[PDB]
Design a protein around this motif. Structure first.
Motif, mmCIF file in Angstrom:
data_model
loop_
_atom_site.group_PDB
_atom_site.id
_atom_site.type_symbol
_atom_site.label_atom_id
_atom_site.label_comp_id
_atom_site.label_asym_id
_atom_site.label_seq_id
_atom_site.Cartn_x
_atom_site.Cartn_y
_atom_site.Cartn_z
ATOM 1 N N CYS A 52 90.726 14.845 34.320
ATOM 2 C CA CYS A 52 91.470 13.772 35.021
ATOM 3 C C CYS A 52 91.200 13.884 36.515
ATOM 4 N N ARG A 53 91.186 15.104 37.038
ATOM 5 C CA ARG A 53 90.938 15.355 38.474
ATOM 6 C C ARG A 53 89.476 15.003 38.787
ATOM 7 N N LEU A 148 83.819 20.988 43.601
ATOM 8 C CA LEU A 148 85.163 20.954 44.240
ATOM 9 C C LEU A 148 86.075 21.879 43.433
ATOM 10 N N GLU A 149 87.086 22.453 44.083
ATOM 11 C CA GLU A 149 88.062 23.360 43.434
ATOM 12 C C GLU A 149 88.807 22.564 42.358
ATOM 13 N N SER A 155 83.681 24.661 32.871
ATOM 14 C CA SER A 155 84.021 26.065 33.238
ATOM 15 C C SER A 155 83.935 26.998 32.021
ATOM 16 N N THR A 156 84.144 26.498 30.800
ATOM 17 C CA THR A 156 84.148 27.313 29.553
ATOM 18 C C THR A 156 82.716 27.519 29.033
#
Ligand SMILES: Cc1nn(C)c(C(=O)Nc2ccn3cc(-c4ccccc4)nc3n2)c1Cl
Ligand SMILES: [Mg+2]
Ligand SMILES: [Zn+2]
Ligand SMILES: [Zn+2]
Length: 315
Positions: A52-53, A148-149, A155-156
């Motif tokens: 979503c981000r 971006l953070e 990431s997995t």
């Protein structure tokens, strides 16, 4: 997985059709995209919060241009969803993931100008990237957002898997450079007609994904006529603004970018369907038979432009 994404009844049914239009409510488009990711990939493909981000950062880096905008990104992504849903055995876990993201990101930070204009203008991006100038920029913008953070939707994945999916995304975004499509489709056509085409060959897969990216990118020609005709106004709004900018540089624009040639648009469209769109969806249908409805809708729109040329329809 207890929090599943759902759409209203009409959207739930019609989103499975190739000719689906995502509608004028931009606040629904992220929901439509998440829905498509959960169904084509799985609800464990992405952490919903990171996704979503990521989506909202991608949306923010699309510009307020008539055509190459957030709505185009989601529309191209939806065409890829429809291809992947109707060919679900043919693509890997990483490919489903990577291709929907590539489609969403494929025109990031587009200002409405072609590679040709950037070269004539002598834009800095043309020094950085001599070929596929805009497309190498779109990929670069994708990498910036992934870094971006809280935005690493991959990431997995292992380091190697992450590198594979970024390579899928890079090649997919570069493939949307229409200049590369002519070579790519010819190679695929020859490979199909000699029976050498091998979906287990990675260089062959790359070409098929490239053609799928072109098919998705052009998918406005595969909508119902009212959608196709209204979208042509947005496409030409950009072409004609670029043609205005070419005239400001003292260069004659090519005819499709000259707003004075508006009355020849129907014949220009006919030209585009015959030289580009029909061959594109023909080759795609040969390789992926369930994509037939894209070719059928393209042929129906070709017939509509012919009806415009003969004065049985106005535009
Ligand atoms: C969707 C979609 N995505 N793209 C990249 C296109 C496109 O490239 N469309 C084109 C091509 C070539 N054209 C020539 C003329 C034209 C107009 C007026 C006078 C003489 C020629 N119009 C054209 N339109 C479409 Cl559709
Ligand atoms: Mg384009
Ligand atoms: Zn593009
Ligand atoms: Zn595009």
């Amino acid at each position: 997985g207890l929090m599943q994404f759902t759409l209203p009844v009409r959207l739930c049914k019609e989103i499975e059709l190739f000719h689906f239009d995502i509608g004028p409510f931009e606040n629904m488009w992220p929901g439509i995209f998440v829905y498509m990711v959960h169904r084509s990939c799985g609800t464990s493909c992405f952490e919903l919060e990171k996704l979503c981000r990521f989506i909202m950062s991608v949306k923010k880096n699309y510009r307020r241009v008539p055509y190459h905008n957030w709505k185009h990104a989601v529309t191209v992504a939806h065409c890829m969803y429809a291809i992947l849903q109707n060919n679900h055995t043919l693509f890997t876990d990483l490919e489903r993931k990577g291709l929907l993201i590539a489609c969403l990101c494929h025109d990031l930070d587009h200002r409405g100008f072609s590679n040709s204009y950037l070269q004539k203008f002598d834009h800095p991006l043309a020094a950085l990237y001599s070929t596929s100038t805009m497309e190498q920029h779109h990929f670069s913008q994708t990498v910036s957002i992934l870094q971006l953070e809280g935005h690493n939707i991959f990431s997995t994945l292992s380091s190697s898997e992450y590198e594979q999916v970024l390579e899928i995304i890079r090649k997919a975004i570069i493939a949307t450079d229409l200049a590369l499509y002519f070579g790519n489709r010819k190679q695929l056509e020859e490979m199909y007609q000699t029976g050498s085409l091998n979906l287990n060959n990675q260089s062959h897969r790359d070409r098929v994904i490239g053609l799928m990216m072109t098919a998705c990118d052009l998918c406005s020609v595969t909508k119902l006529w009212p959608v196709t005709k209204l979208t042509a106004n947005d496409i030409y709004a950009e072409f004609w603004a670029e043609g205005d900018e070419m005239k400001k540089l003292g260069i004659q624009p090519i005819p499709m970018m000259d707003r004075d040639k508006k009355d020849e648009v129907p014949q220009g469209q006919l030209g585009f369907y015959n030289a580009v769109a029909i061959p594109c969806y023909t080759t795609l249908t040969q390789i992926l038979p369930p994509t037939e409805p894209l070719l059928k809708a393209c042929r129906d729109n070709l017939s509509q432009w012919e009806k415009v040329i003969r004065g049985e329809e106005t535009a």
